[PDB]
Structures are given as structure tokens and as C-alpha cells.
Amino acid sequence: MIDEALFDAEEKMEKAVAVARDDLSTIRTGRANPGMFSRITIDYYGAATPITQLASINVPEARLVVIKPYEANQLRAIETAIRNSDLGVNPTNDGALIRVAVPQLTEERRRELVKQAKHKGEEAKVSVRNIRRKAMEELHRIRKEGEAGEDEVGRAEKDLDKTTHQYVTQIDELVKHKEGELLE
């Protein structure tokens, strides 16, 4: 129904934007961040487990990451996964700490990661548009069933369109800023 349809769609778009932000932060960049390690997993006692759940990742310099595994006997498997990952990094360890030097990306790899950023932006925008479509269908159903006034539904429709544009723009900005980060 009118308010419920609209307020729900807005809330869902906001979280679709939050989701897009977290997704974008997983892209390998200069100026290391815990996020780019978040999709790396190890077999943790029979279950694929994100390395970020098993260690404290620190960034004490733009190109130096220091990972402390919560369980010392997991260090090796963690280091291996990091080395096997597509991050293009070569870990070392001092028995207790994994040290990860972050190389400057190749021009080739930048273009690739830029492509990825744009793809994730596209996925998020399709989500936003589907959220809009569902709420717009409800507004249509409300109008034809005479459940609300015609002017009412028309105003809800432009508000809905406005809100959708706003969140699609936010996603484009997130991708835009990711790219700027990748080309730096």
C-alpha cells in the first residue's frame, strides 16, 4: 500500500547501496584495506572461512599489510590462501605475523579492476531498479483497484522515481570514486 510500498522501497534501496559499497571495497587497490582480503578463505576445520574472521588485518603503511592470525597454527594456511589469491602479492612471515607488501598495480590490472568496479555498480543498479519496479507495480495495483486517489498515486510515483534516481546516482558515485582510487 502507498506509504508502505514507498518507505519499504527506500529502505531496500539504501541497503542495496550499503551492499554496493561493501562489494566495491573488496576490489584490490593501492592503499591496502582489510576489505580486499575479505573474499580470501581457508578450510577452517572443514568449512570455507573468510580469512578476515580468523585474523586482525592492519595497514601501518600504504603498501604494507600486517596480518595476525588468532590461532598461530592457522598462519600457514592463511598465508597460502593470500599467496594463491588474485591479489598479486607475495606474503612473508616472522613465525607469528604475516607481512604483506602491496605492489603498484600494472596498467593492465588497473583496466581489469576498473572493469570489475563498473560491473559491481551495474549489478547494484539493477537491484535498485528491481526494488523500484516492485513498488511501482504496487502503486499501479493501488490505482486500478481504486484504493487511493489518482493525484495521490501520481505524486507517489514521482517521489518513487526521484528516490530511485538518487540511489542509482549514489552507486555511480561509489564506482566513480573506486575508479579514481584504482587510477591513482
53, 99: one domain = yes
Alpha-helix runs per DSSP H in 38-90? 75-84
Beta-carbon neighbour count of residue 92 at 10 Å? Answer: 11
Structure determination method? X-ray
CATH number of the CATH domain containing 37: 3.30.1360.40
DSSP 87-132: T----EE-SS-EEEE-PPPPHHHHHHHHHHHHHHHHHHHHHHHHHH
What's this structure's resolution in Å? 1.9
Which of 40, 71, 105 lies at the terminal end of a domain, its last residue? 105
147, 184: one domain = yes
Please give the Cα distance from 47 to 70 (Å, whole number). Answer: 17
Please give the Cα distance from 78 to 82 (Å, whole number). Answer: 6
CB 70 within 8 A of CB 56: yes
112, 80: one domain = no
Tally of structural domains, the chain: 2
36, 11: one domain = no
121, 145: one domain = yes
CATH number of the CATH domain containing 9: 1.10.132.20
Which of 85, 105, 125 lies at the terminal end of a domain, its last residue? 105
Range of the domain at 5: 1-30+106-184
Q: Helix, strand, or coil here: 93?
A: strand
CB 148 within 8 A of CB 142: yes
